[PDB]
Ligand binder design. Structure first.
Ligand SMILES: Nc1ncnc2c1ncn2[C@@H]1O[C@H](COP(=O)(O)OP(=O)(O)OP(=O)(O)O)[C@@H](O)[C@H]1O
Ligand SMILES: Nc1ncnc2c1ncn2[C@@H]1O[C@H](COP(=O)(O)OP(=O)(O)OP(=O)(O)O)[C@@H](O)[C@H]1O
Ligand SMILES: [Mg+2]
Ligand SMILES: [Mg+2]
Lengths: 7, 555
């Protein structure tokens, strides 16, 4: 999940 | 046999009935049975064994619709053009005939600009107007080729008969005349407009589009278009060996008496002066015209000739199609060719690249596309990451889509690391059915849009984005998108650095704006030159290269 990975 | 050389040329009032102010046909021959039948008198003619000169008339309804004019320096080419236009203007209304001029011969057609029959005159300078004037008429031809077929319009004569009723709107035009003063100057400085105008002459006469072309020599016309000029008016020629009537007859044509010429039948004619006052002198020519144009303008209180729609200095982004009518396609501006919207499709091509000099509108374009993505994608469908050292994308980076913002070289490295890891996980496994590759099945999630402004200063020796270069051509399978803008400073040698090299290699869409030609070609076939703010050559290897004008987003 890109949404959780970077922040 | 021939009549002795005349000492003073005729004027239009001499060769026309008593002219009156009409309500409402303008200042014309009120009630004449010959008014508005597209015939026009252009002077006097001396046929053999005549003892009195007859009025020279031209029929422009039918095959002789296209007019060609030749002759050497100061032979009277430009004055003939002005006489033909004025003569037609005296026998017609602005709703019946329209004129669009490309003046490359002394710029003297400007005096007829205030005529309600004339909608555009372009000097040598006004390239933007020149290039657009032709495209305007070319678009009208294509419009009528479908308008006439969808309705009961079999011939052009039928169309005129319908507008003669006064109850027919039509396409807003009548008979349109494209006038060029120096065909040589055109095909030299506008090679693209040579073939396009030629195509207009080919099939446009049956749709009411006329070409009135002038040049120094007949040989300056290509055979493709020279043969299309039905009506040819040949004046005193240097090197009469390329005359279209007779060589020996042309060598005996009076020099230093401008207006004198030959017809295709070999008749001696003399160009009349574009006046309606009666003054047969030519040293009072600049002023004859003015009064005439004024009179025609005053007597006409109706619609004028439609203008050439120019590319706007500032194109409001509110004009471009909304997300409800465009879909995932993102409009970024309109093209010069047809003033139609120009879309971007990231489902067809993942990346996008911009080149432009100082304050040309690079950062504005990125704010446009980003806002376009925001408008069309939910944050669960597409997430945004900004690399913005100059902090120029603040207005569009406050959305929920944004999950990264790098304003420093350090912050960029911290993001690309999490980016490289996140995207490598989406790299397709070796064994996959084509349907799994087509639908992108093995991974579920959102698309990643990486927006980079001023790539020029993020591309140092230790470019923090370089670790992404190796997976850039794999973007279609992993859902990655790079949207990059760069300056022109060293842009040429910046085509070989790992990232731009691979982005350009993928034939990615992009445009070039206001660059210096010292930088050479960057995208496609266009060598950069100074362009206005927001304008650029939209290079796409599906639709070739097109000059477009990008939109402006407020704040
Ligand atoms: N019928 C005429 N009688 C007397 N003088 C004329 C006539 N026609 C043109 N002239 C004069 O000849 C001069 C040049 O005319 P014109 O501009 O038509 O030639 P041109 O072919 O356009 O020259 P260039 O090749 O330099 O553009 C004008 O200043 C005009 O006063
Ligand atoms: N699409 C457009 N049409 C017309 N004018 C524009 C357009 N976009 C920007 N401009 C004008 O150009 C100026 C500079 O715009 P912008 O900052 O987008 O260019 P830039 O490439 O970011 O400049 P810099 O190189 O300084 O970052 C603005 O003041 C704006 O008024
Ligand atoms: Mg001229
Ligand atoms: Mg900028």
């Amino acid at each position: 999940r890109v949404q959780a990975l970077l922040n | 046999i021939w009549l002795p050389p005349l000492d003073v040329p005729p004027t239009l009032d001499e060769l026309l009935p008593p002219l009156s102010p009409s309500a409402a046909h303008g200042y014309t021959a009120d009630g004449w049975e010959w008014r508005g039948r597209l015939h026009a008198v252009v002077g006097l003619v001396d046929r053999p064994f005549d003892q009195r000169r007859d009025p020279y008339w031209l029929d422009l309804s039918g095959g002789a619709g296209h007019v060609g004019v030749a002759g050497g320096p100061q032979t009277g080419k430009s004055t003939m053009l002005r006489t033909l236009i004025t003569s037609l203007a005296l026998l017609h209304t602005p709703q019946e005939v329209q004129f669009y001029c490309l003046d490359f011969g002394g710029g003297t057609l400007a005096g007829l600009a205030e005529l309600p029959h004339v909608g555009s005159v372009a000097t040598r300078l006004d390239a933007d107007r020149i290039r657009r004037t032709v495209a305007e008429v070319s678009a009208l031809l294509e419009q009528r080729e479908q308008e006439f077929t969808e309705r009961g319009i079999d011939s052009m004569a039928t169309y005129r008969r319908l507008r003669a009723t006064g109850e027919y709107a039509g396409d807003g035009f009548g008979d349109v005349f494209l006038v060029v003063d120096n065909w040589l100057t055109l095909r030299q400085d506008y090679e693209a407009l040579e073939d396009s105008i030629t195509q207009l002459a080919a099939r446009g006469l049956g749709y009411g589009i006329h070409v009135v072309l002038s040049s120094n020599k007949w040989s300056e016309f290509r055979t493709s278009i020279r043969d299309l000029l039905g009506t040819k008016l040949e004046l005193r020629l240097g090197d009469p060996y390329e005359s279209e009537v007779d060589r020996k007859k042309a060598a005996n044509v009076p020099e230093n008496r401008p207006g004198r010429g030959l017809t295709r039948d070999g008749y001696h004619f003399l160009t009349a002066l574009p006046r309606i006052d009666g003054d047969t002198s030519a040293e009072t020519l600049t002023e004859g015209i003015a009064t005439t144009v004024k009179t025609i303008r005053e007597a006409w209180h109706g619609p004028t000739a439609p203008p050439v729609r120019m590319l706007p200095n500032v194109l409001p982004a509110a004009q471009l199609p909304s997300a409800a009518e465009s879909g995932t396609r993102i409009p970024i501006g309109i093209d010069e060719d047809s003033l139609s919207p120009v879309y971007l499709d990231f489902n067809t091509d993942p990346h996008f690249l911009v080149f432009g000099d100082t304050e040309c509108g690079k950062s504005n374009l990125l704010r446009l596309i980003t806002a376009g993505i925001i408008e069309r994608y939910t944050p669960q469908q597409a997430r945004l990451i900004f690399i913005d050292y100059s902090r120029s994308l603040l207005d569009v980076a406050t959305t929920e889509h944004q999950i990264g913002y790098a304003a420093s070289s350090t912050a960029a490295s911290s993001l690309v690391r999490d980016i490289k890891g996140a995207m490598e996980a989406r790299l397709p496994p070796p064994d996959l059915t084509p349907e799994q590759l087509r639908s992108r099945s093995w991974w579920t999630g959102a698309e990643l849009f990486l927006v980079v402004d001023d790539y020029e200063m993020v591309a140092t020796s230790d470019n923090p984005l370089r670790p992404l270069a190796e997976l850039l051509p794999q973007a279609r399978d992993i859902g990655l998108h790079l949207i990059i803008a760069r300056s022109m400073g060293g842009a040429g040698r910046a085509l070989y650095e790992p990232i731009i090299q691979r982005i350009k290699e993928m034939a990615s869409p992009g445009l070039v704006m206001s660059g210096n030609k010292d930088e050479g070609i960057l995208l496609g076939n266009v060598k950069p030159h100074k362009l206005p703010q927001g304008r650029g050559y939209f290079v796409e290897r599906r639709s070739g290269t097109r000059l477009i004008q990008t939109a402006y987003r407020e704040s």
